[PDB]
Tab-separated table of C-alpha atoms in Angstrom:
chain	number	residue	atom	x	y	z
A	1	UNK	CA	-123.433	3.316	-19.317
A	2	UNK	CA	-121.603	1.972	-18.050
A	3	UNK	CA	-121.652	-1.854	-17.183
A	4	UNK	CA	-117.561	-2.777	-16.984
A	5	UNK	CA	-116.949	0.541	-15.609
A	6	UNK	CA	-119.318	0.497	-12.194
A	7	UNK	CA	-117.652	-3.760	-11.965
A	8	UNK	CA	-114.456	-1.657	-11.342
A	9	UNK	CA	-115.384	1.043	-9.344
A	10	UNK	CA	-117.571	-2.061	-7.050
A	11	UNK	CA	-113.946	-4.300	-7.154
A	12	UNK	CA	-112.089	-1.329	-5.132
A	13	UNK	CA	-114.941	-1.075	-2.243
A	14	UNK	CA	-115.328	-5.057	-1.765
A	15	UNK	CA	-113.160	-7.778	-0.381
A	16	UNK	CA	-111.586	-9.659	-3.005
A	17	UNK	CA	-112.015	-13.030	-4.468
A	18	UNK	CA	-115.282	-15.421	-4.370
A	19	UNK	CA	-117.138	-16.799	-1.147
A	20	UNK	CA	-118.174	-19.892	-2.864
A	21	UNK	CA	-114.937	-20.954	-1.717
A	22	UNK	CA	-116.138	-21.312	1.816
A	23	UNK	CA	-120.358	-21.767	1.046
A	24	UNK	CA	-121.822	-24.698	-0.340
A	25	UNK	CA	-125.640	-25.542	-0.884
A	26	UNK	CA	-127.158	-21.952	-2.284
A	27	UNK	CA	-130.783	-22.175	-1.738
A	28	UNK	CA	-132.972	-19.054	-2.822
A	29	UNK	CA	-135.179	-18.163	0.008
A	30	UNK	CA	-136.781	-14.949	-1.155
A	31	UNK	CA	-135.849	-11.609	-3.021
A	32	UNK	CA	-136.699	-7.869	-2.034
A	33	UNK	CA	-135.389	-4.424	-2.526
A	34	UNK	CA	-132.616	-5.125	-4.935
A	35	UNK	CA	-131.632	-8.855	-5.683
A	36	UNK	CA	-132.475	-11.840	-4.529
A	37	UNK	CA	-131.449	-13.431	-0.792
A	38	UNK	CA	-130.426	-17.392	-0.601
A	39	UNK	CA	-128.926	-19.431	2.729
A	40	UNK	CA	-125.799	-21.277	2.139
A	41	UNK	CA	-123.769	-23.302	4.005
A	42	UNK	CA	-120.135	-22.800	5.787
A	43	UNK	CA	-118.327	-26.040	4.723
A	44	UNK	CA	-115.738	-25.594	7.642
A	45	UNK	CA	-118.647	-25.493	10.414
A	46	UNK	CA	-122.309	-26.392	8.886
A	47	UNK	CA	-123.270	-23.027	10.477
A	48	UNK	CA	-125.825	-21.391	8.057
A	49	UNK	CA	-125.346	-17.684	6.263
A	50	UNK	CA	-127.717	-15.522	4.244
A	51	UNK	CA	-126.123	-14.066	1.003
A	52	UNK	CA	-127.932	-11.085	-0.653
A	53	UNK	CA	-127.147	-11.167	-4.537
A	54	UNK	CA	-127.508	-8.043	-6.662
A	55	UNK	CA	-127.207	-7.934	-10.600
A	56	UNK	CA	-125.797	-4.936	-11.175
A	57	UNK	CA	-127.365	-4.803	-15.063
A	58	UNK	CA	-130.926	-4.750	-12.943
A	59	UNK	CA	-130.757	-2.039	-10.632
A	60	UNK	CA	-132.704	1.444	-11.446
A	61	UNK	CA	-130.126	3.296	-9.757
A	62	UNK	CA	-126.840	0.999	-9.503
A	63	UNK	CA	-125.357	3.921	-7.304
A	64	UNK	CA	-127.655	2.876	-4.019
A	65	UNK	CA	-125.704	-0.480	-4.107
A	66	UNK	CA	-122.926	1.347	-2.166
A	67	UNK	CA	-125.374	1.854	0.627
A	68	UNK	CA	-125.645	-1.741	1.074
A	69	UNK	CA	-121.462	-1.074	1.810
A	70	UNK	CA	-121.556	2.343	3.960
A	71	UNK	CA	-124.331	0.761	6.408
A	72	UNK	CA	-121.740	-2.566	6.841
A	73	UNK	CA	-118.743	-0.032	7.485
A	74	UNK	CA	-120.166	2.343	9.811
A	75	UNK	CA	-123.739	1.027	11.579
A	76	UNK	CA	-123.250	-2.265	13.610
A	77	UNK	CA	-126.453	-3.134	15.913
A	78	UNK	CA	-128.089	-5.663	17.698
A	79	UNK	CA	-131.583	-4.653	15.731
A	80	UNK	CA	-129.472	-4.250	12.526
A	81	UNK	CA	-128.802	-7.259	10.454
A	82	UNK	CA	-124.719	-7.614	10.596
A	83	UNK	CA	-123.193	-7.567	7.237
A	84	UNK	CA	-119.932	-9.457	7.556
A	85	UNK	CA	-118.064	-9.433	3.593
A	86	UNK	CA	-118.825	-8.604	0.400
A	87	UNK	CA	-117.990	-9.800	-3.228
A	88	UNK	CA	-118.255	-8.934	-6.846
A	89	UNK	CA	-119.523	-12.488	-8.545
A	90	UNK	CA	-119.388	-11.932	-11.996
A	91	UNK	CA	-122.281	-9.120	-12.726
A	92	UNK	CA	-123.406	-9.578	-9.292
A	93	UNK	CA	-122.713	-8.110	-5.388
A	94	UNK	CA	-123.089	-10.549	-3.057
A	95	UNK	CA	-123.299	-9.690	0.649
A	96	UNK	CA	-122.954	-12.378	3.011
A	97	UNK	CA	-124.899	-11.789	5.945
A	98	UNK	CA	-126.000	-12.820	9.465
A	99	UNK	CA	-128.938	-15.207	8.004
A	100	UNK	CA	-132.268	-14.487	9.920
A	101	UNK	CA	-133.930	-18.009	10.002
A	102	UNK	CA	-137.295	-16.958	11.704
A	103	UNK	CA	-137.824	-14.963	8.065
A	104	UNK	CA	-139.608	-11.902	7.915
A	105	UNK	CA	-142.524	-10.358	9.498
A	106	UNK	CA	-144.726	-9.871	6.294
A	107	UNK	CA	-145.430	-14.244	6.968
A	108	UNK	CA	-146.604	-13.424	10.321
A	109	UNK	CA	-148.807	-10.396	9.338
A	110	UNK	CA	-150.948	-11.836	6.679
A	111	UNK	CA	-150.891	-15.410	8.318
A	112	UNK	CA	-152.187	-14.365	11.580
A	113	UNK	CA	-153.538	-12.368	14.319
A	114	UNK	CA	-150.517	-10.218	16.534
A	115	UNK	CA	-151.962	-9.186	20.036
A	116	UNK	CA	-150.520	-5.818	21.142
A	117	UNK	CA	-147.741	-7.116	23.713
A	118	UNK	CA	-146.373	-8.847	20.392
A	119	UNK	CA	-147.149	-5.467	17.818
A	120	UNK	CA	-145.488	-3.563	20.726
A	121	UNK	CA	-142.392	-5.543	21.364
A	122	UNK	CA	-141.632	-5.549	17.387
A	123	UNK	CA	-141.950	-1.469	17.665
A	124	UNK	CA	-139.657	-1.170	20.616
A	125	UNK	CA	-137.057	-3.357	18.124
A	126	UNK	CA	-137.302	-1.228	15.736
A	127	UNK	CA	-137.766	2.380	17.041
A	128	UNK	CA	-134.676	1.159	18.774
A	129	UNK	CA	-132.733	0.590	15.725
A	130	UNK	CA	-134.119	3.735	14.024
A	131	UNK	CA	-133.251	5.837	17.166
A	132	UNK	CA	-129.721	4.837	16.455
A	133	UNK	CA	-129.477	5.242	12.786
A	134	UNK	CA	-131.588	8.365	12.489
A	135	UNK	CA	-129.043	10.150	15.438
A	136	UNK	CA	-126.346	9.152	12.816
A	137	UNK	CA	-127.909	10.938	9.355
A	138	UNK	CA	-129.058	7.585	8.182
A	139	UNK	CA	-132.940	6.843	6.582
A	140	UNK	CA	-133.350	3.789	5.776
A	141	UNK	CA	-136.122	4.854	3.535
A	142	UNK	CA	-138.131	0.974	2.997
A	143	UNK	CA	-139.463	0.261	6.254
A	144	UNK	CA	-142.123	-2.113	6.197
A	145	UNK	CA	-143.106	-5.874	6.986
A	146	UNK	CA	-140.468	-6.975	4.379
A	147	UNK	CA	-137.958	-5.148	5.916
A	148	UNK	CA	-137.857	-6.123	9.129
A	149	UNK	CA	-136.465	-9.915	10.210
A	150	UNK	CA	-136.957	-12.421	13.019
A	151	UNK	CA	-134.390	-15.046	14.640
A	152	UNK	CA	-135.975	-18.170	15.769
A	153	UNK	CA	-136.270	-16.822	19.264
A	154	UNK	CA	-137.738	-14.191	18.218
A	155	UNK	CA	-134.875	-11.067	17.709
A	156	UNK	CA	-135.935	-8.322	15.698
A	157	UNK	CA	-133.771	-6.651	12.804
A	158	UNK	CA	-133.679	-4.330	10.084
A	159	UNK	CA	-132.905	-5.372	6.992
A	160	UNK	CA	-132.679	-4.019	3.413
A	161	UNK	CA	-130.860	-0.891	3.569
A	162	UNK	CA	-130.706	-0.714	-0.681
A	163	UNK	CA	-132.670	2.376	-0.653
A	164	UNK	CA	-131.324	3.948	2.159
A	165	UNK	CA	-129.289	7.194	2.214
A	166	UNK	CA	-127.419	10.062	4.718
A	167	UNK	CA	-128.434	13.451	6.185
A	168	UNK	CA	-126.018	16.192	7.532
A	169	UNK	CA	-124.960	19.338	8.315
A	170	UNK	CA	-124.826	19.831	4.310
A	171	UNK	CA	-127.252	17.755	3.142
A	172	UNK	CA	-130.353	17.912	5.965
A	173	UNK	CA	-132.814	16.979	3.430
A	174	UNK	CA	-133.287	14.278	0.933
A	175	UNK	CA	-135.408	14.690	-2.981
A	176	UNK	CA	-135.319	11.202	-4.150
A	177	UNK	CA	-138.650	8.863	-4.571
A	178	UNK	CA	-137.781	6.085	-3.044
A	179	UNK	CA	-139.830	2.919	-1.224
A	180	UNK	CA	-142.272	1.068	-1.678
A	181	UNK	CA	-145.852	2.881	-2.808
A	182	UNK	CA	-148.224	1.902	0.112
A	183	UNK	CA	-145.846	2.363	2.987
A	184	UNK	CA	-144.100	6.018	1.705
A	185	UNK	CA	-144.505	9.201	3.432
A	186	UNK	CA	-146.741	11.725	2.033
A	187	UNK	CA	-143.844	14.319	1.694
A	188	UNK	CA	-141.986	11.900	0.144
A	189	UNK	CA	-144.275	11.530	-2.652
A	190	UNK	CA	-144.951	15.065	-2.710
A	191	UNK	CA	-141.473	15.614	-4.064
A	192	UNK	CA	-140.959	18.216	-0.873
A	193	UNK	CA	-137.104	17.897	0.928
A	194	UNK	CA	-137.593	15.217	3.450
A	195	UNK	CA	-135.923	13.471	6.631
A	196	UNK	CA	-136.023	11.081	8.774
A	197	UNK	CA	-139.621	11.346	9.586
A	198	UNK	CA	-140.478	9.824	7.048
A	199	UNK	CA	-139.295	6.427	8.322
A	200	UNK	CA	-141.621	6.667	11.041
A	201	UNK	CA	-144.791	7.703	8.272
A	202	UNK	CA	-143.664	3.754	7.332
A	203	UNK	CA	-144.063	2.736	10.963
A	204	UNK	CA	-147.222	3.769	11.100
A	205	UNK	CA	-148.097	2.024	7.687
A	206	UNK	CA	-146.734	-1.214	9.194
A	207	UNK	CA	-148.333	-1.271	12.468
A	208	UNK	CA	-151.434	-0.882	10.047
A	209	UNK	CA	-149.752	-3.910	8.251
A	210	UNK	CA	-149.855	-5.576	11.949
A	211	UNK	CA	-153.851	-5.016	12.567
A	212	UNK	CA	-155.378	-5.085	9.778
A	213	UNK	CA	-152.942	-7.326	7.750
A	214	UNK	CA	-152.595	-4.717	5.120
A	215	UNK	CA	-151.366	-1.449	4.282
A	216	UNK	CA	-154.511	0.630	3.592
A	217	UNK	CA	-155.232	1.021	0.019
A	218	UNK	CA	-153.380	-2.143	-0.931
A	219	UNK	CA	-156.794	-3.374	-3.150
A	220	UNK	CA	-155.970	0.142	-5.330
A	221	UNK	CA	-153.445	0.356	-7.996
A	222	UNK	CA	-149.979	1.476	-6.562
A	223	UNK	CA	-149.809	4.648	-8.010
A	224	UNK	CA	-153.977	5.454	-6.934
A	225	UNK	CA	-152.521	4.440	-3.258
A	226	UNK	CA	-150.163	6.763	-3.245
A	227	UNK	CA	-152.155	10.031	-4.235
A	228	UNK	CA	-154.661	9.034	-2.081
A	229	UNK	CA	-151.886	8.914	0.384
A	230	UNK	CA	-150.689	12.271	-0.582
A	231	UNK	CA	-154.147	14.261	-0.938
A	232	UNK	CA	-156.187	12.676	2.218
A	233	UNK	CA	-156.503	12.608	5.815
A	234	UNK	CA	-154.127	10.099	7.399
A	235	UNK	CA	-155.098	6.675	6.674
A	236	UNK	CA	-157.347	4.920	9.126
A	237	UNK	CA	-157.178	1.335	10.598
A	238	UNK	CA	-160.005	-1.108	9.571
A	239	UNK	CA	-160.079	-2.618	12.498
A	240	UNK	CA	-160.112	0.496	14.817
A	241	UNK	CA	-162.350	-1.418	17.187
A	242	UNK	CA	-160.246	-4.188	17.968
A	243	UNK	CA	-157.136	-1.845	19.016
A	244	UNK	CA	-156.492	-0.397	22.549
A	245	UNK	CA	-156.773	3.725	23.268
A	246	UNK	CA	-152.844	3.484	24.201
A	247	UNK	CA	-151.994	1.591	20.434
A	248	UNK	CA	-154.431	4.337	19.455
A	249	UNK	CA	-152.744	7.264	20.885
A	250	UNK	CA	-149.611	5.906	19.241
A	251	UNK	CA	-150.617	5.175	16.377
A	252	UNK	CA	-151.616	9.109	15.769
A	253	UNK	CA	-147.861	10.518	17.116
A	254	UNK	CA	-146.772	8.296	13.564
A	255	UNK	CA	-148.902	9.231	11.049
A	256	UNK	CA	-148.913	12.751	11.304
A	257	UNK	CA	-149.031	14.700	7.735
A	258	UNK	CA	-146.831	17.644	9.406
A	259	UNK	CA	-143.497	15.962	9.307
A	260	UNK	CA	-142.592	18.648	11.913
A	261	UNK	CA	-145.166	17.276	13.885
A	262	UNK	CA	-144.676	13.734	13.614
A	263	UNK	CA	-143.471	12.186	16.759
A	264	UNK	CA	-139.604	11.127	16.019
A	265	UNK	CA	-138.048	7.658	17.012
A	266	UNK	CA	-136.295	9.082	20.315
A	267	UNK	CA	-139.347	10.320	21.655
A	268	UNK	CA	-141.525	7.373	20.567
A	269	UNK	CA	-139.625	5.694	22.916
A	270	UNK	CA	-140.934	6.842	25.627
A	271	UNK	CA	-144.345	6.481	24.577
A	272	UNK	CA	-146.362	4.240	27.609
A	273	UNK	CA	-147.843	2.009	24.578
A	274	UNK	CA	-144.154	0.522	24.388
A	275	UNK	CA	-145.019	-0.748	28.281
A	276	UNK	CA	-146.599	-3.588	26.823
A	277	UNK	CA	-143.955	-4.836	25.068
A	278	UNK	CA	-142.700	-8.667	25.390
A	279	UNK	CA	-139.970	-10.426	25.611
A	280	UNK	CA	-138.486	-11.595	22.178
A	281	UNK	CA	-140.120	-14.709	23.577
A	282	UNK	CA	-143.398	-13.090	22.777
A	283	UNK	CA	-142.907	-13.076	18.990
A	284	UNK	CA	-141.905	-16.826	19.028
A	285	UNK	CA	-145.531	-18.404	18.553
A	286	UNK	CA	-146.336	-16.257	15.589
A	287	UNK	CA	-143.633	-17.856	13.264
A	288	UNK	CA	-144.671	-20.654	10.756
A	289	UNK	CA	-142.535	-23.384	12.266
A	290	UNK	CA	-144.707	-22.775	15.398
A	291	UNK	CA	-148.125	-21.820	14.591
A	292	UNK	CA	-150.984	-24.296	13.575
């Protein structure tokens, strides 16, 4: 209620016609968040594209697919994947996208081992990005392995902005539940008004993902996760021993409970565990083409 109805309102907001007028060779490489993501192929150049497809009959909230559209508009960066057009095929959105061919960091982190100059480097990208986006009202509300995306040599981006949504002013807090169960904030899933601390609760969940190869509680049913999320102590690594006092020391200015507390992106930044960060050259043996 209704189907026809959000095709129009989706029409207005896109540019028109069909882009498989200019892409041959769809190939499904994955699917997250909201639809499914395939590479295609420029005809005029051989120069390859990522295109994120959406049914709109399939979304829980079909409103959040005009996120995907305020992020392209507004918030261009380097450690943001670039959105260049969008379509309405048939039932479906398609976003064609700046396609991320080193795939996404969730192979890397349950493949193999990431040494700290390499876990550091990927949260310098993305504190970076966050930095950015949170100084503008934006959460992007699903950050996690999934979420973020490699280039061959080894760029970092954010991706998959379907769930994200804007602080102001008038609206400093958000109510929605929203993520992915292991990863979300403990405020978040205590229904409490929430910001963007909550994207750095996710950080801290991921550089978990990065050491242990996990998010904790990933064995327990998703909803089990999450209250044990809610009701305990912050989450501990499993492999405590293996991590530097500096990751350490980090590690605790993210997953603080007290959202008012929690360390935010702009001052993470300065944090001296970020001093071991490497080049995006660093990142390049961990990818699948590379490793043996």
């Amino acid at each position: 209620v209704s189907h026809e109805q959000f095709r129009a309102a989706l029409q207005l907001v896109v540019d028109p016609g069909d882009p498989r007028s200019y892409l041959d060779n769809f190939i499904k490489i994955g699917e997250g968040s909201t639809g499914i993501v395939c590479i295609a192929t420029v005809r005029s150049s051989g120069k390859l594209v990522a295109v994120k497809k959406m049914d709109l009959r399939k979304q829980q909230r079909r409103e959040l697919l005009f996120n995907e559209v305020v992020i392209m508009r507004d918030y261009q960066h380097e450690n943001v994947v670039e959105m260049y057009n969008s379509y309405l095929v048939g039932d479906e959105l398609w976003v064609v996208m700046e396609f991320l061919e080193g795939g996404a960091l969730t192979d890397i982190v349950t493949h193999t081992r990431m040494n700290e100059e390499q876990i550091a480097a990927v949260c310098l990208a993305v504190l970076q990005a966050l930095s950015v986006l949170h100084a503008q009202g934006v959460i992007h509300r699903d950050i996690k392995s999934d979420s973020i995306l490699l280039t061959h040599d080894g760029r970092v981006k954010l991706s998959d902005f379907g769930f994200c949504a804007q602080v102001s002013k008038e609206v400093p807090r958000r109510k929605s539940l929203v993520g992915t169960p292991y990863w979300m904030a403990p405020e978040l899933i205590s229904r409490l008004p929430y910001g963007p601390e909550v994207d750095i609760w996710s950080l801290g969940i991921m550089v978990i993902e990065m050491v242990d190869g996990e998010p904790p509680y990933f064995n327990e049913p998703p909803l089990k996760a999450m209250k044990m999320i809610r009701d305990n102590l912050p989450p501990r690594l499993k492999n405590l021993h293996k991590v530097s006092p500096s990751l350490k020391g980090f590690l605790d200015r993210l997953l603080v409970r007290d959202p008012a507390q929690r360390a935010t992106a702009a001052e993470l930044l300065k944090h001296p565990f970020l001093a071991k960060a490497g080049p995006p050259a660093s990142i390049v043996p961990l990818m699948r083409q590379n490793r043996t």
